Structures are given as C-alpha cells and as structure tokens.
Design a protein around this ligand. Sequence first.
Ligand SMILES: *[C@@H]1O[C@H](CO)[C@@H](O[C@@H]2O[C@H](CO)[C@@H](O[C@@H]3O[C@H](CO[C@H]4O[C@H](CO[C@H]5O[C@H](CO)[C@@H](O)[C@H](O)[C@@H]5O[C@H]5O[C@H](CO)[C@@H](O)[C@H](O)[C@@H]5O)[C@@H](O)[C@H](O[C@H]5O[C@H](CO)[C@@H](O)[C@H](O)[C@@H]5O[C@H]5O[C@H](CO)[C@@H](O)[C@H](O)[C@@H]5O)[C@@H]4O)[C@@H](O)[C@H](O[C@H]4O[C@H](CO)[C@@H](O)[C@H](O)[C@@H]4O[C@H]4O[C@H](CO)[C@@H](O)[C@H](O)[C@@H]4O[C@H]4O[C@H](CO)[C@@H](O)[C@H](O)[C@@H]4O)[C@@H]3O)[C@H](O)[C@H]2NC(C)=O)[C@H](O)[C@H]1NC(C)=O
Ligand SMILES: *[C@@H]1O[C@H](CO)[C@@H](O[C@@H]2O[C@H](CO)[C@@H](O[C@@H]3O[C@H](CO[C@H]4O[C@H](CO[C@H]5O[C@H](CO)[C@@H](O)[C@H](O)[C@@H]5O[C@H]5O[C@H](CO)[C@@H](O)[C@H](O)[C@@H]5O)[C@@H](O)[C@H](O[C@H]5O[C@H](CO)[C@@H](O)[C@H](O)[C@@H]5O)[C@@H]4O)[C@@H](O)[C@H](O[C@H]4O[C@H](CO)[C@@H](O)[C@H](O)[C@@H]4O[C@H]4O[C@H](CO)[C@@H](O)[C@H](O)[C@@H]4O)[C@@H]3O)[C@H](O)[C@H]2NC(C)=O)[C@H](O)[C@H]1NC(C)=O
Ligand SMILES: *[C@@H]1O[C@H](CO)[C@@H](O[C@@H]2O[C@H](CO)[C@@H](O[C@@H]3O[C@H](CO[C@H]4O[C@H](CO)[C@@H](O)[C@H](O[C@H]5O[C@H](CO)[C@@H](O)[C@H](O)[C@@H]5O)[C@@H]4O)[C@@H](O)[C@H](O[C@H]4O[C@H](CO)[C@@H](O)[C@H](O)[C@@H]4O)[C@@H]3O)[C@H](O)[C@H]2NC(C)=O)[C@H](O)[C@H]1NC(C)=O
Ligand SMILES: *[C@@H]1O[C@H](CO)[C@@H](O[C@@H]2O[C@H](CO)[C@@H](O[C@@H]3O[C@H](CO[C@H]4O[C@H](CO)[C@@H](O)[C@H](O)[C@@H]4O)[C@@H](O)[C@H](O[C@H]4O[C@H](CO)[C@@H](O)[C@H](O)[C@@H]4O)[C@@H]3O)[C@H](O)[C@H]2NC(C)=O)[C@H](O)[C@H]1NC(C)=O
Ligand SMILES: *[C@@H]1O[C@H](CO)[C@@H](O[C@@H]2O[C@H](CO)[C@@H](O)[C@H](O)[C@H]2NC(C)=O)[C@H](O)[C@H]1NC(C)=O
Ligand SMILES: *[C@@H]1O[C@H](CO)[C@@H](O[C@@H]2O[C@H](CO)[C@@H](O)[C@H](O)[C@H]2NC(C)=O)[C@H](O)[C@H]1NC(C)=O
Ligand code: NAG
Ligand code: NAG
Ligand code: NAG
Ligand code: NAG
Ligand code: XYP
Ligand code: XYP
Ligand code: CL
Lengths: 446, 446
Amino acid sequence: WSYSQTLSANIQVNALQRYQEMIGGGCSGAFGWACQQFPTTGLTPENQEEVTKILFDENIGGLSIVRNDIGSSPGSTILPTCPATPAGPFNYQWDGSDSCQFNLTKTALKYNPELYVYANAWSAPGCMKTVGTENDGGQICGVRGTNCTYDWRQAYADYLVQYVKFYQAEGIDISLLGAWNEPDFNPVTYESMESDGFQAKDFLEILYPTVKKAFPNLDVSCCDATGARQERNILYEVQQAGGEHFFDVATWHNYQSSPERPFNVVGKPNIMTEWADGSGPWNTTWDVSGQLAEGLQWALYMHNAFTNSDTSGYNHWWCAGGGADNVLISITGNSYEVSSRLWAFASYFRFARPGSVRIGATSSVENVYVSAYENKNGTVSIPVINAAHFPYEVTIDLQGLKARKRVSTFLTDNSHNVTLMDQSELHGSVLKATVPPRAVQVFWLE
Amino acid sequence: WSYSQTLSANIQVNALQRYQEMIGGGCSGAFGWACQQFPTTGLTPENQEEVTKILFDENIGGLSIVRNDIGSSPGSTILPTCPATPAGPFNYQWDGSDSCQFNLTKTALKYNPELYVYANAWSAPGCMKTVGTENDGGQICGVRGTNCTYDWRQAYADYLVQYVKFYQAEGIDISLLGAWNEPDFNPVTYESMESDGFQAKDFLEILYPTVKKAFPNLDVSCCDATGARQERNILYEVQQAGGEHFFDVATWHNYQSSPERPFNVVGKPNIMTEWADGSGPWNTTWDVSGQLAEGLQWALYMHNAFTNSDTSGYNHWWCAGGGADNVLISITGNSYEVSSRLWAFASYFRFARPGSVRIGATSSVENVYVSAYENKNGTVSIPVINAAHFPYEVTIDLQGLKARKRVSTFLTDNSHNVTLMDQSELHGSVLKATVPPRAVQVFWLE
Ligand SMILES: *[C@@H]1O[C@H](CO)[C@@H](O[C@@H]2O[C@H](CO)[C@@H](O[C@@H]3O[C@H](CO[C@H]4O[C@H](CO[C@H]5O[C@H](CO)[C@@H](O)[C@H](O)[C@@H]5O[C@H]5O[C@H](CO)[C@@H](O)[C@H](O)[C@@H]5O)[C@@H](O)[C@H](O[C@H]5O[C@H](CO)[C@@H](O)[C@H](O)[C@@H]5O[C@H]5O[C@H](CO)[C@@H](O)[C@H](O)[C@@H]5O)[C@@H]4O)[C@@H](O)[C@H](O[C@H]4O[C@H](CO)[C@@H](O)[C@H](O)[C@@H]4O[C@H]4O[C@H](CO)[C@@H](O)[C@H](O)[C@@H]4O[C@H]4O[C@H](CO)[C@@H](O)[C@H](O)[C@@H]4O)[C@@H]3O)[C@H](O)[C@H]2NC(C)=O)[C@H](O)[C@H]1NC(C)=O
Ligand SMILES: *[C@@H]1O[C@H](CO)[C@@H](O[C@@H]2O[C@H](CO)[C@@H](O[C@@H]3O[C@H](CO[C@H]4O[C@H](CO[C@H]5O[C@H](CO)[C@@H](O)[C@H](O)[C@@H]5O[C@H]5O[C@H](CO)[C@@H](O)[C@H](O)[C@@H]5O)[C@@H](O)[C@H](O[C@H]5O[C@H](CO)[C@@H](O)[C@H](O)[C@@H]5O)[C@@H]4O)[C@@H](O)[C@H](O[C@H]4O[C@H](CO)[C@@H](O)[C@H](O)[C@@H]4O[C@H]4O[C@H](CO)[C@@H](O)[C@H](O)[C@@H]4O)[C@@H]3O)[C@H](O)[C@H]2NC(C)=O)[C@H](O)[C@H]1NC(C)=O
Ligand SMILES: *[C@@H]1O[C@H](CO)[C@@H](O[C@@H]2O[C@H](CO)[C@@H](O[C@@H]3O[C@H](CO[C@H]4O[C@H](CO)[C@@H](O)[C@H](O[C@H]5O[C@H](CO)[C@@H](O)[C@H](O)[C@@H]5O)[C@@H]4O)[C@@H](O)[C@H](O[C@H]4O[C@H](CO)[C@@H](O)[C@H](O)[C@@H]4O)[C@@H]3O)[C@H](O)[C@H]2NC(C)=O)[C@H](O)[C@H]1NC(C)=O
Ligand SMILES: *[C@@H]1O[C@H](CO)[C@@H](O[C@@H]2O[C@H](CO)[C@@H](O[C@@H]3O[C@H](CO[C@H]4O[C@H](CO)[C@@H](O)[C@H](O)[C@@H]4O)[C@@H](O)[C@H](O[C@H]4O[C@H](CO)[C@@H](O)[C@H](O)[C@@H]4O)[C@@H]3O)[C@H](O)[C@H]2NC(C)=O)[C@H](O)[C@H]1NC(C)=O
Ligand SMILES: *[C@@H]1O[C@H](CO)[C@@H](O[C@@H]2O[C@H](CO)[C@@H](O)[C@H](O)[C@H]2NC(C)=O)[C@H](O)[C@H]1NC(C)=O
Ligand SMILES: *[C@@H]1O[C@H](CO)[C@@H](O[C@@H]2O[C@H](CO)[C@@H](O)[C@H](O)[C@H]2NC(C)=O)[C@H](O)[C@H]1NC(C)=O
Ligand SMILES: *[C@@H]1O[C@H](CO)[C@@H](O)[C@H](O)[C@H]1NC(C)=O
Ligand SMILES: *[C@@H]1O[C@H](CO)[C@@H](O)[C@H](O)[C@H]1NC(C)=O
Ligand SMILES: *[C@@H]1O[C@H](CO)[C@@H](O)[C@H](O)[C@H]1NC(C)=O
Ligand SMILES: *[C@@H]1O[C@H](CO)[C@@H](O)[C@H](O)[C@H]1NC(C)=O
Ligand SMILES: O[C@@H]1[C@@H](O)[C@H](O)OC[C@H]1O
Ligand SMILES: O[C@@H]1[C@@H](O)[C@H](O)OC[C@H]1O
Ligand SMILES: [Cl-]
C-alpha cells in the first residue's frame, strides 16, 4: 500500500571505498528437486530449458550459484557400497545423472558460463560415521569425541575429491567444496551429520591439503550452520583448534539466526548458502502482505547481508519444483510460476556480476536503502530500495566514477519486474530520480 | 551431544558498567488462548491455577508480563456496536471476562504482585478504519494518507483508554498501552491494522496526551513490528514526523528480522513482545536437535537480545493451551506439559527481577556467553551459557560487588531444570566452577 507524500533522500556512492568481492545468487536442486525441474514427464524439455534459463540467464534471474548435494543415500551416492576399512579399495559409481543435479548444473552452465558450482555433502557415507548411517546426525569417524573401529577422515576427504573428479571429467569445474550441512542440527530423518569447530578442524586439516593436491584452485567451505550465530561459534572453534588456514569461505544459512554484524574470520568471504520460507504456501507477491516470503522483503534481507555482514553470495533453498514456498519457481505438471523473490535476486545479480566489488554507498534516510557494486569492467550498479510507502526524490552523488557516460534505470515493484524505465547520458556526477514506494530501483552506470 | 575435553574461560563482571533496566519475561492469552488456560471443561480449576503459577511464580517460570489483546472482533471488543460518527454516544461494554484475559491477568497478579500488563490492540474497531473491518489491515481514519468520512483518531484514543479504565476499576494496573500489532504486515483473515511511522505519529500525537491525562504513569508503546528492521523503520519515521516524545517503549517481534545492534531510539527501553516456533510441533527438549524451538536456543536468543540490542523484556507468543509450539505450556484435556523454553526464561527472570539493571559482563571465549544483572536490592545474577559441547572451567572476576557474601549456582541442561547445584560463602571476588556442556548455569550472588 502507498499514499500521497514526497520526501527527499541524499545518496553518496564512492568507488574509492571498497568492500567484498561478490560471487552471485543461486539455489539448489538437492533431494531430487533437480529431477522435478528436469522430469521429462509433465514439464516439457522446452519448458525445462525455459525455467533454467529464467533462473540463470544474466538478463533474467541473473543467478550464478548451483549448490549440489554430494549425496550419501541409496541411489544418490557415488559410494553405494563401502569397503570394510579405510584401506579400501573404493568402488566409486557415477550414473551421469547425480539425482538430476548433473542436468541442472550442465544446463545452468549453458545459460551462465560463469557458473559457480558449490558441491556440498549433507553427510558422509554411513560407513564413515559414528552412527553407521547417513541419517540421524553423528560424526565423521576419527575426529575427536569419536570411537569408531577405524579413522575414516582421509577416506571421506578422498571421497569428496572423487565427486569433484566426476564433474571435472564432464567438463564442469567445481568452485566450492563443503563437507557438512547444518552440523549444529540433527533433523534425524534425512542426510545429516553433526560437528563442533574442534571436530571440524580435525577433519579440515585432512580435507584441505587433500583438496589442494588435486584441485589447487578449489575453495573449501565451513560449515553451513543453520544460522549466523551458530556459524560464528563453529568458526571460533575451528580457529581455536588451529584450523584458521584449513578453509577458504564461511558458509551459513539464515534459518536460525540472522546477522547485522560481520563474521569472525579475517580475509575470507562468506556466502549465505540456503534460506527459504520453509512453512508457508507458495507465494509470488512483491509487496502485498509484508510477510517474509515476499519479493520486497527478500530484497531487504539481501541488502542487510551484503552491507552489514559483507556477504558475497546468497542462495534460495531449492531452484524449482514442488515443496510449496521452498522454490524460486513452482512447477505443477507442465505449468510453472515465478516468485517475485527472483526479481529481488535479479535486482542485485543481473547487474553486479561475479567478480564485482561492493563499493561505498550511504543514504541520508534510514529506510531508503542503498548499496553499490563495481564490475571488473568498470560498470556500476546502484540498487536503491525505497522501503517507505510513498515516493522519494533521491539525489545520488558519484565519486570516483567520472569515466561513466550513460545511466539506465530499472524498476521492480508490484507492477514491474526489473523493467527498464529510463536511459540517459550522464552529464555530470549527480543523478536525480524519483523512486516509487516499496520498490527496488537499480541505477546501471556504463 | 557432548564429548570429553575441558577448556577454560575467563569472565569479568563489573557493576560499575550499567545498561538497561529490565522489565521481565511473559506471554499472551490473546484470541481465546486465555480460555484454553481457563476452560469450562477439561483442565480442572486446581490445574488452571497450577499452570498459571508455573508461569508467573518468581520461583518457577519467573515471568512478569501479560500481553492482552484489546479486541475488535464480535464478542471480544468493548465496543460491540459503533456510533455513526466519532461524536458518539459510545456504548462501551465490559463483560468481566475479556475473552478470559481478565482471568489470566487476575490469576497471574496473584502469583506475581509486580505483574507488568501490556494492553495491545491488534486493530481499531472496523468503523474507525479505512477498510471498515477489524480484519484486512487498513489504517486509522484521520492519519495522513486516509480519506474516511470522519477523523476517528480521538475516538480510537478514547476507546483504548476506556479499556484501560475497565481494568483499573477492577484493581489491575496497566503498565503499557499499544495501538497496533505488526503494522508492517496484513494477515488478511484476523485482527490487523497497517501503518508507517508518519501515520503512526499522526495517531500517537493524539493518543499520548490523552493517555497521560487519564493515567500519568501509563507508558505507550510503538509499534510491535514483525521484526527488528521493520521496527527500526517505523521508529525512524515516527521521529522524522516529530513524534519522538509521543511514545515511551519500543516494542518489536522476532519473526521477520532479528537484531544484533541496538534500536534507533535514545532514552527509551525496548521489549521483544512476541515470538514463538509458529510452525513446528509441540516441543519440550532443551538440547537434543539444535532446532530453534529448543530451550537452549531460546536462552541464546535472549542472551543476544539483552546484550546486543539492550532489550529489557522478552515474550513468548502464547502462555498456555493448544496451537502446537506457539505456547510455553501445552494443555490437552486435564493434562499439561511444560516446554524447557520456560527454563531458559527462568534462568534470566527468576533471578533478574523487575527493576534490575544489566551490568558489564565479558567472556574470553566466544561461545561461553555471559550477562549479568543487579537487582534493586543489590543481589546479582550471572547467567552463563556454555554453548560448547564439552565442559568449561570458568573463572569469574567480580568488580564493584565487594558487599556480596554468598553464591548459589543453578543449572539447566537436558537433566536439570534450574536445579540448585551448590551454595557457598563468597571470599574474595573470584568464583570458579565447571559449567557442563550445552547448559545455562546461573550464579546467584547475595
Ligand atoms: C533481593 O531480591 C531477591 C529477588 O526477589 C530476593 O530473593 C527472592 O525473595 C523472594 C521474596 O522473599 C522469594 O520468593 C518467596 O519464596 C517463598 C518460597 O520460598 C520457598 O521456596 C523457594 C523455592 O524453592 C524451590 O527452589 C529451591 C532452589 O532450587 C529448592 O531448593 C526447593 O526445594 C524448591 O525446589 C522445588 O521447586 C523448584 C521451582 O521453584 C524446582 O525447580 C525444584 O526441582 C523443586 O521442585 C526456596 O528458595 C525457599 O528456601 C529459601 O528460603 C528459606 C527462607 O524462607 C530458607 O530457609 C532456605 O534455606 C532457602 O534459602 C536459601 O536458599 C535459597 C535458594 O533456594 C537462596 O537464594 C538463599 O539465599 C538461601 O541460601 C523456600 O523453601 C514464597 O512462599 C514467597 O511467596 C510469598 O510472596 C509472594 C510475593 O513475593 C506471594 O505471591 C506469595 O503468595 C507469598 O505471599 C505470602 O507471603 C508474603 C511474605 O513472605 C506476604 O507478603 C504475603 O501477603 C503472603 O502472606 C501470607 O502467606 C504467608 C505464607 O507465605 C503467611 O505467613 C502470611 O501470614 C499470609 O498468610 C515468595 O515467592 C524468592 O524465593 C527469592 N529468590 C531467591 C533466588 O532466593 C532476595 O531475598 C532479596 N534480598 C534482600 C536482602 O532484599
Ligand atoms: C561490462 O559488464 C556488463 C555486465 O556483464 C556488461 O553488460 C552485459 O553484457 C552481457 C554480455 O554482452 C549482456 O548479455 C547478453 O545479452 C544478449 C541479449 O541482449 C538483448 O537483450 C537484453 C535484455 O533484453 C531484455 O531486457 C531489456 C531491458 O529491460 C529490454 O529492453 C528488452 O526488451 C528485453 O526485455 C524482455 O526481457 C526482460 C528480461 O531480460 C524482461 O524483464 C522484459 O519484461 C522483457 O520480457 C537487452 O538489454 C539488449 O539490449 C541492449 O543491447 C542492444 C544491442 O544488442 C541495444 O540495441 C539495446 O538498445 C540495449 O542497449 C539486447 O536487446 C544475449 O544475446 C547474450 O547472450 C550471449 O552471451 C551469453 C553469455 O554472456 C551466452 O550464454 C549466449 O548463448 C549468447 O552467446 C552468443 O553470443 C556471444 C557473443 O554475444 C558469443 O560469445 C557466443 O558464442 C554465442 O554466439 C548475452 O546474454 C547483458 O545484457 C549486459 N547487461 C546489461 C545490464 O547491459 C557490459 O556490456 C560490459 N561492458 C563492457 C564495456 O565490457
Ligand atoms: C524438567 O523439565 C522437562 C521439560 O518440562 C520435563 O520433561 C518433560 O516431562 C513431560 C511430562 O511432564 C514429558 O512428556 C511426557 O513424556 C512421556 C514420555 O514420552 C516418551 O516416551 C514414551 C514411552 O517410551 C513414548 O510413548 C513417547 O512417544 C510418543 O509420544 C511422542 C511425543 O508425543 C511422539 O512423538 C511419539 O510418536 C509417540 O506417540 C515419548 O517417546 C509420555 O509418556 C507422556 O505422555 C503422557 O501424557 C501426555 C499428556 O502430557 C498424553 O498425551 C499421553 O497419552 C500420555 O498419557 C508425556 O508426553 C516430556 O517428554 C519431558 N520432556 C523432556 C525434554 O524431558 C522434566 O520432567 C522436568 N524434570 C522434573 C524433575 O520435573
Ligand atoms: C512479473 O512477475 C510476477 C511474478 O512472477 C508475475 O505475476 C505472477 O504471474 C503468475 C503466472 O501468470 C500468476 O499466477 C497465476 O495467477 C492467476 C490469477 O490467480 C488469481 O486470480 C484468479 C481469478 O482471476 C483466482 O481464481 C486465483 O485463485 C487467484 O486469486 C491464476 O489464474 C493462475 O492459475 C492458473 O495456473 C495455475 C498454474 O500456475 C493452475 O494451478 C490454475 O488451475 C490456473 O490454470 C496462476 O496461478 C501470479 O498470480 C502472478 N503474481 C503476481 C504477484 O502478480 C507477472 O505476470 C510478471 N509480469 C509480467 C509482465 O510478466
Ligand atoms: C503469496 O502470493 C500469493 C500469490 O502467488 C498470494 O495469493 C493470494 O492468496 C489469497 C488467499 O491466501 C487469495 O485470495 C488470492 O487470490 C491469492 N492471489 C493470487 C494472485 O493468487 C498470497 O496471498 C501471498 N502470501 C503472502 C503471505 O503474502
Ligand atoms: C521437541 O520436543 C519433543 C518432546 O516434547 C521431541 O519429541 C520427540 O519426537 C520424536 C519424533 O519426532 C519421538 O520419536 C520422540 O520419542 C520424542 N521425544 C519425546 C521425549 O517425546 C521433538 O523431537 C523435539 N523437536 C525438536 C525439533 O527438537
Ligand atoms: C540428463 O542429462 C543426461 C546427460 O546429459 C541425459 O542423458 C538425460 O536424458 C538428461 N535427463 C533429462 C530429464 O533431461
Ligand atoms: C573404543 O572402543 C573399543 C572397542 O569397543 C574399546 O575397546 C575401547 O576401550 C574404546 N576406547 C575408549 C577410550 O573408551
Ligand atoms: C473468570 O473470573 C471470574 C471471577 O473474576 C469467575 O467467576 C469466572 O468463572 C472465571 N472464568 C473462568 C473461565 O475461569
Ligand atoms: C474522498 O473520497 C470521496 C469518496 O468517498 C471523494 O468524493 C473525495 O473526492 C475524496 N477526497 C479527496 C480529497 O480526494
Ligand atoms: O528445516 C530446518 C528448520 O526447521 C530449522 O529451523 O533450520 C534448519 C532447517 O533445515
Ligand atoms: O504468523 C506471522 C508470520 O507468518 C510472519 O512471518 O511474521 C508475523 C507472524 O504474525
Ligand atoms: Cl542468537
């Protein structure tokens, strides 16, 4: 809702002030959701392509991250049968599908050659765990606080590297490798595995050098905690255990704690690798209810992560399929719907591409939010969020950008999906525009 | 889960460092939940008393806040029929029950004489709103951005004070008065009412003097937003509209944004007035899953609010009854179960009574959390949270508390509910103790 009133906001953008390098937005097709996106029956191949294009085409959804589950369940793991001991031998199996995640990754790469693939195990194979199953939490055998018949850490590290080798042999490079999902949480009934930071360091000290031997440019994550606080605690313990240099990227989910402060790690980026409305009905609205599932709320949640916790990337939970509101695109039979959450993602990531660097951006109005990003090639994106219920006349002063010639204005609100509104020549270093209520307006500088 | 290893933590508590004055913990019986706590069949009267005692007895749950809905629905409002205009006559009706909230409040007061009653409207009566109904959001007629046939602001302010008058005539002091619930959110199907901060100020400028003339000691809240960020935006706009001194307390919910920083008000306390696990099954565990419903997680959530947003109070959604995990005490027929979330509440509020002041407390270990509270009468509570998965040997150095002579230690974990562990004399200003894993240990100094 909105009403008639106008106020003004002053914004300063400064390319000389430089923060995190951005990675992108994304989503997962784990647990067979990739197969719902690529079912053959129901959704036609043309429509399967179109849904994947909508997500990963730079000009539409703008996403770049595909998060795949390194599966540990029957039919989803590269190690369906374990050897008796870590001495092996190991019989690795690849079916060319990977629960359709290979289809998702290959197709997304077709639409985005800069795809950033995150391969993330939810659990070690059961034989490698204290509980002897991939379900019900438990620990990698061999970390402190365990007493298995053998130490399985090297074997688990080798198994993760073998998963990466399967994708590499198909011509797909993995960018990030993770060994746990939500180690602070035991959901009991599906792939899970628990850890504190001392135990995680006991594994990372074997995983990290094992990975760099095979793939010197493959980054290692820690540790996909359910919330930012839980992630900070694991990071603290990893560093206290001596493992500061046994991971490269801090990963965390937004379910069980949200930050307003950076993470307790020096020289490492962080990615919010999973969040969704896990309980509500499927929802597409931008700003009708004000509920957390809506597109405008997701634009604001991202602004918070990128400006207050220096976050470099952001993932929805699932990409597309069923699961009510856990997807960005709902699929039913041969039909689909796009949530306007995707236009919140695109408002950032259609314009701030991989390798962009967040730069200084301030606003004189508390709920007229701004951030700004400078691509490797010098183009600059300034997503402004007018979270107020009436228009703001913004004045944007540009510093360090005298080389820019043109400005394009894009608008997302209840009647616009990243719509091009205006294109003009820059004839100084000041931009003036009226941003409608409850909207994201992106100023694209070239 | 836990394992065998012991590390040490150094804690410094300084009474010369002072922060917020505490109000307490609490819950609501709104929307008929008070009638589930005091039903006409099922739970016996003796068990109704016992449930309420478990919540509001200082020695058990330790709660002090009862949050009541000033109802606007048929059967639940003091204005069942509206006049055609704001001139009235207003035929108010008081039924002595208030959807059993009178019974809840009266009984809670019997167990806690310092009860802090928060009377909170979810909506104005529909006749005073743009939408003509108490449901479906909409605005108070007369604030900016409305075009109703009449300006109903004074009428709504008089209605709210009349509700207070009915309680005060029955011998119950109301401590806080609120005129919106979640004005950033339209749930459509139940009592609701929308506002930004400019519109809110347009009403508060009427409500506030009306309130203080009738009840000089009655505080006014703003504005029970669904989250901290939404609350900060409304507070910004109220202040921008000139209304900094037309409200006394900042109220907010933890559903749609959680803080790690203070609120944008000077000289006003804040209360987290509503949160719960809104979607999960009934849950009582302390630390089994690591899911946000568990008692340990609530201890940590409260530690965050009290130490990082200087929060003075904290409310569960409902007190007792049905509604799965939305209550602190689940009632089924003539039976009831207590969630260990209540022992997270008690660990703070059994010992930090109303009027206590949070004081300096630091920890040398990131996930050994500490806060500290000094009661008006000089006693001091130090709730320590060992969020690690193994025991910590803590050394607590006390500054500014030479007059303390005795220390009692209380423990909450998977097998203790605020259990008294030890009582010793205080010699020197140094306490030493081992805090078990995944536990809240309270040091009570007298
Ligand atoms: C400051 O401040 C602070 C805070 O506030 C304080 O403190 C506090 O105080 C308060 C007041 O006093 C209190 O309260 C009270 O209480 C009472 C009771 O008591 C009892 O109980 C308790 C508890 O118990 C429990 O717990 C424990 C621990 O753990 C244990 O051990 C036990 O066993 C139990 O347990 C159980 O339960 C639980 C829960 O609770 C659980 O958990 C478990 O498991 C189990 O089950 C206790 O504590 C006590 O004891 C104590 O004390 C005694 C004396 O008495 C002694 O002898 C002992 O020894 C002890 O002490 C020791 O210990 C402790 C701990 O325990 C420590 O702390 C110390 O220090 C020492 O060391 C007992 O046993 C009650 O009763 C009360 O009530 C009342 O009041 C109210 C209000 O307030 C009301 O409402 C009610 O109703 C009543 O009223 C009445 O009374 C009054 C007076 O009293 C009046 O006013 C009125 O009017 C009425 O009157 C009527 O009635 C009467 C009778 O009663 C008659 O007489 C007449 O005539 C008429 O008729 C109250 O509530 C609390 O407690 C406290 N806290 C603490 C923590 O401590 C302080 O003090 C201050 N200080 C200054 C200096 O100021
Ligand atoms: C610095 O970095 C910047 C960031 O990367 C970079 O800007 C971006 O560059 C890339 C790469 O060049 C651009 O992506 C290409 O886009 C081509 C299609 O472009 C046409 O469509 C665009 C989108 O059009 C929609 O949106 C417009 C804006 O709202 C509307 O006006 C349109 O009507 C249309 O709207 C419809 O769709 C919307 C969703 O998209 C929807 O909301 C809306 O409602 C409606 O449904 C237009 O922007 C573009 O128009 C501009 O350019 C034309 C000139 O072509 C002008 O005439 C226009 O006036 C306007 O200025 C076009 O109309 C793709 O074809 C192209 O695909 C190829 O590349 C990808 C990989 O990048 C491959 O996967 C793909 O297969 C293609 O590969 C083929 O070609 C390549 C070589 O091109 C070759 O190597 C390969 O082998 C193969 O043969 C690509 O995706 C991107 O658009 C730019 N973004 C922005 C914001 O500008 C910038 O240039 C860099 N600067 C410098 C100096 O280096
Ligand atoms: C400290 O504080 C804690 C927290 O308040 C106290 O611990 C809690 O106590 C309550 C009782 O006051 C417990 O609830 C009861 O739990 C028992 C045990 O249930 C378990 O074991 C059963 C036997 O093996 C098993 O049947 C149960 O499984 C069924 O139920 C679960 C849960 O509903 C369900 O998921 C399953 O599918 C099964 O259907 C379960 O594994 C239980 O027997 C009790 O049920 C009786 O009462 C209820 C009404 O309350 C009624 O519905 C039943 O029909 C039956 O009549 C009841 O649920 C609770 O589990 C405890 N929680 C924790 C974390 O321990 C503790 O007591 C306090 N300490 C002290 C000293 O007071
Ligand atoms: C910008 O981006 C937004 C968000 O992606 C787009 O808006 C969404 O578009 C989808 C698809 O068109 C909408 O979904 C469809 O909504 C129709 C309207 O439903 C309402 O109204 C009818 C009566 O008019 C009621 O019966 C109904 O209950 C709703 O209240 C539905 O009729 C559609 O249902 C059909 O398809 C589904 C499968 O998806 C079947 O299950 C049904 O049986 C039926 O055949 C469908 O649900 C969605 O509502 C839009 N959301 C919003 C917020 O607008 C914009 O279109 C896009 N802009 C542009 C220009 O492309
Ligand atoms: C999420 O978005 C959906 C649309 O995808 C909203 O759906 C409306 O739901 C109500 C009842 O809940 C229906 O009366 C409307 O017809 C629906 N609209 C459409 C366009 O389908 C839903 O309200 C949104 N939920 C939230 C919490 O914002
Ligand atoms: C919340 O607490 C309840 C106990 O009140 C837990 O209940 C267990 O549920 C499983 C099935 O989900 C049963 O097999 C167990 O027997 C139950 N335990 C008890 C003691 O009843 C529930 O698991 C907890 N949920 C979370 C998320 O922690
Ligand atoms: C998935 O990919 C494989 C190989 O790329 C292909 O053989 C198979 O048909 C694909 N499945 C679907 C549903 O597209
Ligand atoms: C570990 O398990 C083995 C096999 O049961 C047992 O013999 C050994 O004592 C255990 N170690 C410890 C330290 O308990
Ligand atoms: C509410 O309180 C009154 C007395 O104040 C009592 O008579 C009535 O029975 C109570 N109602 C319930 C449901 O307990
Ligand atoms: C207010 O609404 C009425 C119709 O209900 C309309 O006639 C009138 O012009 C409106 N007032 C203004 C100032 O627009
Ligand atoms: O679904 C889980 C949710 O219930 C919990 O709160 O956070 C982690 C999620 O995996
Ligand atoms: O139930 C509501 C929830 O859906 C929303 O997320 O936050 C406010 C709550 O009242
Ligand atoms: Cl927290």
